[PDB]
Structures are given as C-alpha cells and as structure tokens.
Structure 1
C-alpha cells in the first residue's frame, strides 16, 4: 500500500515538515519516508499497530542505497485506528526530531548526513490530508 510520493521538496535544516493524515480503522501500520530518493532515506518513520511482529511500536530506520539500517524502536504510541493524526518532523544534519500528536519528542540520528530532504512518501493504512512546510 503506497500513497503519495513527493519530490523537489528541498526541506533545509531548521525547516519543519508538518504531515497530518487519517489513520485507517483497520490500521495495521503506516509510514512516512524522507530522504533523497526511495533507495536513500534518512527517516523511515513506521508506526506499527500490529505489523512485522511489532504491536504498538514505532519503528524508525534509514535506508542507504537500498539497504535498511539498524532499527530504532520507540515505545510511545499515541495513535488510535481511525483517527486524524498530525506529526511534525524537524530536519537537522546532526539528527531528526519527531513531534508526535501528544507533544512527545524523540530524536533519530541523521545517518546519511543529508543536508536536504527532497523525497517524501506515504504508505500503509494512512491517508495524507495535509503537508505543511515551516
């Protein structure tokens, strides 16, 4: 299940990517990919309601030239199926900072050392309703 694919983003460090969308009722999981292209992502944000063995766990990873990196799992899961959830990702060369709906923040290392995000992609059981550049 793949949703929108966005290119020519040119989100530079300091800028904030605000993505709001609707989680499906039968939501197994959903994801957001940020990087330069599909085979090179600095952030594979993947909330797992019940998927790939994870129950209510956020799986984050990088992808370098097609190879997934080491996964980082977050136990904070403020998501409910069928709800409209907003997420906010601030870019930075050192790392990425994610703002969940409740105001919970956590970092993810910027492994590819990307100085600019140009690719965005959505997937899973989610419907992007808004993308805001700040």
Structure 2
C-alpha cells in the first residue's frame, strides 16, 4: 500500500549513519531499504520479508552491480510485525555496514564496493516518517 521514497545526494560517508523511522502496512509482504548509487547499483539491499519469494519472516541482504544481484546473506532475527513501526539505523564503515534496530538487535553486511560516500537511498513498501543523518 505504497511506493517508496527516493533520496539522492545523500552523500553518506564512512563513519556516519542514516536512521529511517517508518511504518509497515498491515498487509506488507515485505519491505526494502536500498543504499547505493542508483536503482541498478546497491551497496546494500536490505529486504525484510514477511511472506515473499519463499521467505517467511526472514531478512535478506545483498548488493547489486549493473542490474545483477550478488550473493545473499540471510538473517534469522526478524524483530518486525506487519502494521508496526520500524526504526532502523545504518552505519557506514569501509569494511561493513552495521544495521541496528530499536529492538537492540544488530548485525552487519560486508561492503563489496567501497564508495567514498553513498549517494542514493530508496525505500519500498515502507511508509516513511522521517530520515536522519549523523
């Protein structure tokens, strides 16, 4: 019940973070937060699947390069429920991106292409409330 917001010139630099605060529709099959250069190049594609692509309550991360998906990293921790409010924070480190939830849960993804700064961010299926940088 939505189409995601897109942000350009975010210019996220190593050692900094982006915190998204949003709301999950009560029939959301899954939602995604993409950090990259454009819709064909993602350093991180964070996908929380409620029931989608054969995944039920599972987090799938991956990168994309020239429209081609890399190898997925699945995560067991799934602190979400349809209709709730998400509060995610992404810290950019040259080696990895640390994802932290208000739940107290944390995990990282490895950086496969170091960027001097990250210019693009987009959301899907997530009704955005506020986006912040630090």
Q: TM-score, normalised by structure 2?
A: 0.96
Using the TM superposition, name which of 110-119 and 12-21 deviates more: 110-119
Structure 2 runs not aligned, ≥5 long: none
2:36 aligned counterpart, secondary structure: strand
Q: CA deviation at 1:63?
A: 0.2
CA RMSD of aligned residues (A): 1.0
Tell me, in whole angstroms, the C-alpha distance in 2 between the residues paired with 1:6 and 1:82.
Answer: 24
- 3-state SS in 1 of match to 2:115: coil
Inter-partner Cα distance in structure 1 for 2:50 and 2:31: 8
Match of 2:62 in 1: 61
Matched, 1:84 2:54: no
Cα displacement (A) at 1:103: 1.2
SS at match of 1:98: strand
Aligned to 2:101: 100
Secondary structure of the corresponding residue to residue 41 of structure 1:
strand
**Alpha-carbon displacement from aligned partner over 1:50-102 (angstroms, at most 9, x marks no partner):** 00000000000000111000000001000011011100000011110000221
The secondary structure found in structure 2 opposite 1:34 is strand
Runs of 4+ in 1 over 4 A off after TM superposition: none
2:93 and 2:37 mapped to 1: Cα distance?
14
Structure 1 regions of 5+ residues with no counterpart? none
